[PDB]
């Protein structure tokens, strides 16, 4: 298709690996490149640790609000919020919100031992029916994305038909549904990436990932105005260990994604 021939080009002029995947909720069409191959989730991944927590919450009523310590020893390489809570308390919904919104590593972290381990999280995964979603290592190691390896990855079909499941269909319940959602909209480190390439009138929820070999992310839920919500789902990585984030690289997938 066309679309196809402008993101194979936008990948070949950015020299590295993009996977797309959009799911427009109007018909059930997709859009897929390199749909099928697998990427380092990176940060992206938070989004199913987040999730997995909020389906305990159907069951254990309060959970959001139990209390969980933050320790000096927990901090790992990247903790904007977790820093200003050490040796002080944050509920389940405040490591959320910080995991999701902030790109939080040690709040990932207190998910992840909440859900008693990377094979917790994976386990969600299964549940809704994500059989290639694998969460395999803790904060920072995931983000390693080594050529190859398959720890850590995800492919773009199957997140976009996850976070479609996870936002828009009902994988949650109702009031933790709408709490995903939430904490979507108010990511605060995605306006270089998908909603960059947008109209500026379009409403996103989005979370980003980066990690080594310059791995750029971003998944995301969007509703354009006066229209059937979509969701996108941008992967990018790069053959040098030591390469930069590309967030323009999804910035021009979805504005190619958009001009469909």
């Known amino acids: 298709s066309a679309v196809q021939q402008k993101l194979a080009a936008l990948e070949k002029s950015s020299g590295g690996r993009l996977g797309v995947a959009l799911i427009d909720t109007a ?26 927590v909020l389906k305990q919450s159907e069951t254990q009523k309060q959970l959001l609000n139990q209390p969980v310590e933050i320790k000096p020893a927990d901090l790992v390489n990247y903790n904007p919020i977790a820093e200003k809570h050490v040796n002080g308390t944050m509920t389940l919904a405040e490591l959320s919100a910080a995991a999701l919104q902030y790109s939080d590593n040690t709040a990932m972290n207190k998910l992840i031992a909440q ?48 976070l479609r499941q996870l936002t828009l269909g009902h994988a949650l319940g109702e009031t933790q549904r709408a709490q995903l959602v939430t904490w979507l909209k108010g990511n605060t480190t995605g306006a270089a990436s998908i909603r960059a390439g947008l ?3 379009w409403t996103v929820g989005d979370k980003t990932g980066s990690g080594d070999y310059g791995t750029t992310n971003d998944i995301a839920v969007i509703w354009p105005q006066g229209r059937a919500p979509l969701v996108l789902v941008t992967y990018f990585t790069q053959p040098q260990q030591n390469a930069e984030s590309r967030r323009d690289v999804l910035a021009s997938a979805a504005r190619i994604i958009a001009e469909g």
């Not at 191959?37 to 990176?42: A, D, I, Y």
């Not at 983000?143 to 190859?148: D, L, S, V, W």
């Open 27 to 52: 018909d059930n069409t997709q859009v897929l490149y390199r749909g099928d191959e697998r990427f380092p989730m990176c940060s992206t991944s938070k989004v199913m640790a987040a999730a997995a």
């Open 115 to 162: 859900l008693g381990g990377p094979g917790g999280v994976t386990a969600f995964a299964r549940a809704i029916g994500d059989e290639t979603f694998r969460l395999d290592r803790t904060e920072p190691t995931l983000n390693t994305a080594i050529p190859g390896d398959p720890r850590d990855t995800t492919t773009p079909r199957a997140m976009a038909q996850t």
């Open 199 to 201: 109209p500026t009138s």
